[model samples]
Target: DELYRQSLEIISRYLREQATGAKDTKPMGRSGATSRKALETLRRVGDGVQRNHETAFQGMLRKLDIKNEDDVKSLSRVMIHVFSDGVTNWGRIVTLISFGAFVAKHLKTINQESCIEPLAESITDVLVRTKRDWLVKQRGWDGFVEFFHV
Candidate 1:
């Protein structure tokens, strides 16, 4: 519990720092929603942090910004920035595009608009590819090989 609380503080600081007069406005819903979502994500990080990596610190590296990251286009752009990490490492990367699409699919519950699709246009192709190649289809070994071959 203490660790989760501490983690929350750190994420709160992160969002606040990313804010500015020019960005992180009301539309991003950072005022309270950010911390709420952050708290939920932080708690989930506990198990993965404890299980998968050599250290608990690796857990924080998991992607947790699907909903909003303190700005209008930040949600969409954050998708681009995260999924297109200049390399492909499924173990290192979380969600890929499925989670992002899930957010889009359930945008209404998250109090988000449907604009996330075009907003993250920068990496839309990559997003679609990752989800198609992995999350959506029940592709076999051939499918796996085909993904990298292209």
Candidate 2:
């Protein structure tokens, strides 16, 4: 939930600033259009985050070799129920790591000749290292579990 909250705060602040600037402008330039488009893009991104949260959670569970979404949902439900005094708390770190892993795995699965391959691989390596570092910090050697599973 921290990730979601932070994302929301960022988007909200950005939109507010854009709106203030738009209002202050005597004659709106191309910036007005760009700002409006950015707001719309952020709205869509936020909506995707909400809608895909569970799917993202499930992906993490799967990467951890937990097998199913039900397992993830149950674990998450219990973790939230117990940890935060009955307040639901989605583990954003897990979801983010899972998503990164998923994207890397997906790229590996692809055999396309696009120029994006090298870029994707480079980005994936960075994400992989980041996830590995986070896992090491959170779960130690056991954090290296997903790599073994893959």
RMSD of each: 15.7, 17.6
lDDT of 1 by residue, 1-150 (tens): 332233224333322322211223333332254344433442344224334442433333234334443543554455555665565543332333223323333344566544353323322344443443442353422232333342
Model 1, position 52, has a per-residue lDDT of 48
Once fitted onto the true fold, the runs of candidate 1 whose alpha carbons sit more than 4 angstroms away are 1-72, 75-86, 89-94, 111-113, 119-150
TM-score of each candidate structure, all chains considered together: 0.28, 0.21
Candidate 1: clashing residue pairs, number: 0
Which residues of candidate 2, in runs, are more than 4 Å off?
1-10, 13-30, 54-150
**What overall lDDT goes with each candidate model?**
0.36, 0.36
Clashes of each: 0, 0
lDDT by residue for model 2 over 13-125, one digit each (tens)? 33333223332233333334433443344344433553577576456535654233343345444443333343221244333333433433333344321312332233233
Query: What's the residue-level lDDT of 67 in candidate 1?
Result: 49
